[PDB]
């Protein structure tokens, strides 16, 4: 006895067909399609193939001089011809990923109100309190399997962008489709608008959100609770909810509460941890060594930092068979007050305590790098230019091949650049970054730095959950995904300095990740699509959305 | 690859409002649209000011329905309602099942098929003809409900006792599916009535200016087989492996061949063969609970040895096999059949159609039913011959002379073709016969008692059996599911029915009867490994009840 | 244009959307090519049946329903499922079907409307829509409205106050505009204004569809009507025809008075009935000799409808003789509930009865008035059945050779007398006509076929005349012109059977002539806006007429 | 009234501010042809905004 929306169904014809992104083929409508659907005359005589349409659009797209104009033309395409959008992205993913994802999506979010054109996603605000379920009914695709949701509090390293954070889930789900093969009709981008503490946006006449400060405490928790309950009631038990770009306290609390009642994943805490782990398994495959033999130092000890560290420690426990507390002993984190150490146990946030070992207090990253002498440095602070020449030279002075992960996004917030990491280390850093850098020529050799970004993981991980009918996420699924990504890494990639295969392999990578995730769901008793298929890799491959145009009756 | 290239329908959706909402029978509530729904969907002024509950709409509709003078007028008004307010139709039907069943199923539905062209109003169901050869799948694509789970299909060749009515047989699957919804709780949106038009041999219909089908004699042999094969392969491709295909009112030889060809490859069921077997078995099981005895201890005599009749026999034998652990060849030996030529016996084997041979036991030839009844001395006598009044006074008296409580089933429909009347069975046995029939008879008063004879209607079985297949994800029908349905139906027969002589519970309990049958069928499907909705829920009765469609209006704001 | 608007989407109809749309649905007449191009294959059975065979099929089942009301029900259901089929069936079987979709069966339908309510028809505007009438009009999905027929249900035929169940009347009236007058049904809007009802039986009926209150009156009533009339002008413009039906007599007059100056309006009961009666009298005198001025007229019922008929007779006498209108009233008498309207009562009459208050001894009963005045014409508007008694008709037949008797009250059960009674009690000599239909009467070897003096002969052509000439006001001379056009169609073929009007089988030809004469008169008076006038108005009217023959669809 | 809640973000922008917003991005296109493409796109997305923008910035 929920209220229901009454939907009418009809055959799309004429301009109705041309104006529906899900069906519009533009000039690719065939002769017969045109004569059966009243398109004759509404289009010019010539029939153009999907492949020529891609070429035409790529031609005009490269004439836009700024990355933001290219993001704009891509989103406009997504909202006019969805299959072309996805075939174009897939076939040009290496070139286009920086424009629809990091870094450009970050700029899109900062300027979202000033470029806002065709509506994308669903906005749920404080003003919908008591009527969330009401709002969800307005979404015209009934069969939702993947939700990506943000409150915009922590967009990349750019801070609080409020209701303009919508570009992040819209981005993420396009990658679920393009990289992961998830059907776009079952994807739902959501922004929850509870206000913003961003003064500049509160005073901007184009800000698209509620002009108030962020709600906190009960007012916030009640809205989230109503949302999560509405999702369960409307979409069932198997809907994947992916949390994106919440602040530390909220992100942890949400994962703690809803991972017992729903199928949830936090991309920053769990996705990032998984991709970094894979990058470490591959880095050790190129330069030798075990995960247990390393000493880890993190700059930044919130969601991503502590989550990556926990996953690394967890995999150390699996490979050594030692208790988890032992496996944390060579993982150290530095926050804004400095090294996290026993003498501060007095007053650390809960998620940092397990990392506080007995050690002298140290104020700065540089002093901690000097005293701890890590084999591995991982930056997630969200603060640019924080891996200095002095730091990379130190890391290069006491390791032959220092592993440097500069994970903060977008590009301007990167801890260092690939250029700086290879030069300041004399060609010896194993380097990966959150955001893309071009190849670096150093002293006559080419380095191709891998992008340690959770886009390698979430698309296949989510596909794995969906094809298996998983109802909960378990940490062993994260380790299974990390291992499936590292296992795709080859000698070809390593010779170029790349810890990951390139994104031209992404569909195949996603199919192996999904297969390993699904297998793990079956093994733990968390899968509801029983029985398992006979070949999970083949099944994942066969499940994947293809954006080649349909023929229409 | 090649099936990815197949053209699809570009369906679009939009919010229904105004007359688009009022003209869609799936959503239309008429005067039951609340003030709030009217204000939110642009209905204000299109309806008068008053809001009428679903219960008052039912009462309103019943009052006018009862003022129509002929059964067929009532059929027409009921079909019109189905096609304008679907939830009102289903709720009206459920709450008045005993009174309305004769207007919307048997016998009125037969009369509607006879006259279907002359009363054709609002379209119902999907017609597939010989002219759609090579493009059957393109026709299925025109049906605007995408997830079909139950199909009831006919070629119209043998509609009740009325013969070949060609394309005008659509009244049958339309009626059956209404019962699947009302009695079984199958959601009407997942039900698809289909008529396959391959011509008709009914000369009257071929000359009737109002006949709605192809104006030609039936296709036979290869042309027919190929169209059917294209239909069955298109059904599988478009709706998947789990769709139920119920065959209805095919000619006899055809009905068996389709069932044997397609039981290997699809989920299929024929109501006239499998359903009837199961309801008769349920009846024997209830009768024996009423008078004592086991199925194994009986001796059974059938008048009529049609292929459909031998399937009743075979199911009785199979159940005797389960209760006894004896091979089925041993259990057939107390089941006898009489033909036009007399008792089916071993010495006739050479001149017997093959389906009769399993029943051809060692015995002296007997030319007549009466001689067979006196020689064999059955405890149970079952009529499927299609000839009225073959259970004579001499027969009923013989049956009553060597049985305390003779069990007598006159299954031939309609009433004029009944082997005997209820009045006769009870009068000629001095009140002692356990009686049931295919056609409805009024109660009988005899000396002291009042007798309400049970009616061998396979609507007692098909709705819960299909529900059971659907809720388990069953992929094949197995004969043990038919046994499980029969036992579940007989277990619902209370002492209240037995006091009045009724071996079946009344249709007022049908929704609960369906859920028990569905549970027993589902449980069998899990047991035989034929279920795909895994794992099974722990309480299948409860689960079956909660899967049942309820036609209470939805709220729209 | 701070005026909100309803955004309407437009698309090509197919599949079920086509089948369930009564305006486009052809049922089994969709052709092979239409089916293949509109996703209908399989949704319909293989055969293609013509429009004519659909009509035959439907008439066959129709004639098996045992009650008139069941036939009305089947016909409304057909109007709401296949419009073109409905209108063609009705036009080709008009004599047979009229008594089932119009008087008398429509009366019973209104009395039982809640109990038989199926497919929605028309637009309901209630007191609860106050302040929001325009918003309700926006919900009607046909934008170009040219003819509104509106009631408040207060005086439905002679049946009284039926409240919101009065809807049946405008709905039936508009069907006749289309079937009989050729107005396109898409441009017709039936409306019921629900302000409550004084019928206690309906207020206590669980199936009553209206507001469960007594009728609003005074300023409250007038405010709703004003908002309504202002909304119709703003939304449909200056040229929309508003036909008022079945208002109480006081409201009927006041609304005609007030809105005649501001809108194109027509009251069917006061003007339509006046015009069909005049035409009947013009025919009747062509058949038995004499002049309108030399008759003596007696009315039973002095409502603003009886006085309306009387006023138009006096007006045409004025035109024919040149005498002032006042003197043309001297031989026109009316009997109300307290008796004959006479000068000695004048001080205490309602003002509208005063022009008829001639000097005469006061008389209490109709019969006394019939014996004292000795009319040549007796016209009944009472709403009370069987008031033209044997004694009255015998009297009329003793001092007139051919007494003219019009028994106008509907439905049949409220008719002043029956045709059997008229011809029997007059010995075959009455020229009789009635509001409701009667079967042929056999008397001493002669067959009498009584005419129907019902405004269905007039309103269809008259509104078509207003519409095609772009008229902006109704003038009394249009009513005289319509009367004369109808009487000019009466021939000796129909007089020989005793019918003062041509049969309904000629109604399209009659309506074209009425429309031509109404339009000519609009141009002649400076009331027409479709300029310049076409030169052959009768031909133009015929060519303007809706045909319900199916369209072919691409 | 028209089932838009959630499909749009919370803020309501006036016709005038939409004009200003579109003019600001229009000026940042480098070529005349790009300005044409953006205008044609607006004519086919929001007809009234297109014509009002054009009339006020003719
Ligand atoms: K970041
Ligand atoms: Na979270
Ligand atoms: Na397509
Ligand atoms: Na039926
Ligand atoms: Na057959
Ligand atoms: Na069969
Ligand atoms: Na029987
Ligand atoms: Na059942
Ligand atoms: Na149909
Ligand atoms: Na109505
Ligand atoms: Na009358
Ligand atoms: Na949106
Ligand atoms: Na809001
Ligand atoms: Na415009």
Characterise the protein shown here.
This is part of a larger assembly, with 4 copies of chain A. With 553 residues, chain A is an alpha/beta fold. Chain A has 24 helices and 15 strands. Chain A has a 7-stranded mixed beta sheet, with helices on both faces. A 5-stranded parallel beta sheet of chain A has the order 2-4-3-5-6, sandwiched between helices. The radius of gyration of chain A is 24 Å and the shape is globular. Chains in contact: A-B, A-C, A-D, B-C. Chains B and C meet through α1, α3, α4, α8 and β2 of B and α1, α3, α8, β1 and α9 of C. The structure holds potassium ion and sodium ion (NA) (13 copies). The site of one sodium ion has 2 residues of chain D, from α3. The PDB classes it as photosynthesis. Keywords: oxidative decarboxylase, photosynthesis. The entry is titled "Crystal structure of maize chloroplastic photosynthetic NADP(+)-dependent malic enzyme".
CA-based shape of chain A: globular
The order of strands across the largest sheet of chain A is 9-8-7-10-11-12-15
* Percentage of residues in helical conformation of chain A: 40-55%
What is the number of helices of chain A?
A: 24
Radius of gyration of chain A: 24 Å
Give short descriptive properties of this protein.
part of a larger assembly; 4 chains; 553 residues; alpha/beta; Rossmann fold; five-stranded parallel sheet; 15 strands; globular; binds potassium ion; binds sodium ion
